[PDB]
């Protein structure tokens, strides 16, 4: 139901943030 | 239902993070 | 009520993320 | 109670994101 | 209660955004 | 249960934001 749908979107938000962290690490390296 | 409304705003937040990751990838490419 | 207020706050958060994506687009435009 | 405390922290998150947007605008300008 | 636990994680997320805003302010100072 | 899963996802999100703050600190170190 709905509480699970909410947790799923939080998952998808963490996933985007991980990709943000990697782009920044690339930038910090060059 | 407001619980569905909450999940939808979270999905929209994920969408914006997706766009942020793309722009940072572009900057890393500099 | 309160679940609505939570959703309205997530929408404001999404709005801020839009502006962040926009400035990042500007910075990418190097 | 608790649902209000949650909305309050979402407020404080949006506030930090607004300050992030302004720092990025400054960077996009110079 | 898990609702208190949720508010606490949100506060911790706000703390991290605070640190992100500081570092960006430092970069804007370049 | 489900509210716990929501909180555990917010904690993972906080963890990603820590790494973002760290890379930004590195970039600030210009
Ligand atoms: Cl990397
Ligand atoms: Cl690109
Ligand atoms: Cl500005
Ligand atoms: Cl500083
Ligand atoms: Na995830
Ligand atoms: Na990468
Ligand atoms: Na990439
Ligand atoms: Na935008
Ligand atoms: Na606010
Ligand atoms: Na400013
Ligand atoms: Na400032
Ligand atoms: Na950190």
Asked if B5 lies within 8 A of C4 by C-beta distance, the reply is yes
Burial class (CB in 10 A: 0-12, 13-18, 19+), D17: buried
d(CA C27, CA C23): 6
Residue among E27, D18, D13 at smallest CA distance from A13: D13
Per the structure block, which two tokens stand in for A4? 């699970």
d(CA A28, CA F22): 10
Asked if E6 lies within 8 A of F3 by C-beta distance, the reply is yes
- What was the elucidation method? X-ray
F–E contact: 3+ Cβ pairs < 8 A = yes
Asked if E9 lies within 8 A of F4 by C-beta distance, the reply is no
Give C11's contacts in chain B (Cβ within 8 Å): 9, 12
Q: Where are the beta strands (DSSP E) in chain E?
A: none
Listed in sequence order, the residues at least 6 apart from C8 whose beta carbon sits closer than 8 Å to its beta carbon are none
Structure-token match 């990697």, residue found: A22
Question: What residues are neighbours of ligand 10 (ion), with CB under 5 Å?
Answer: D 22
Task: Specify the long-range contacts of residues C7-10, CB closer than 8 Å, at least 24 apart.
Answer: C7/B2, C7/B5, C7/B6, C7/B8, C7/B9, C9/D7, C9/D10, C9/D11, C9/D14, C10/B6, C10/B9, C10/B10, C10/B12, C10/B13, C10/D10
Q: Which residues of E6-19 are buried (b: 16+ CB within 10 A; e: fewer)?
A: bbebbbbbbbbbbb
d(CA B30, CA F3): 42
């Amino acid at each position: 139901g709905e509480l699970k749908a909410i947790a799923q979107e939080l998952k998808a938000i963490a996933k985007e943030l991980k990709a943000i962290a990697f782009e920044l690490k690339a930038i910090a390296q060059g």
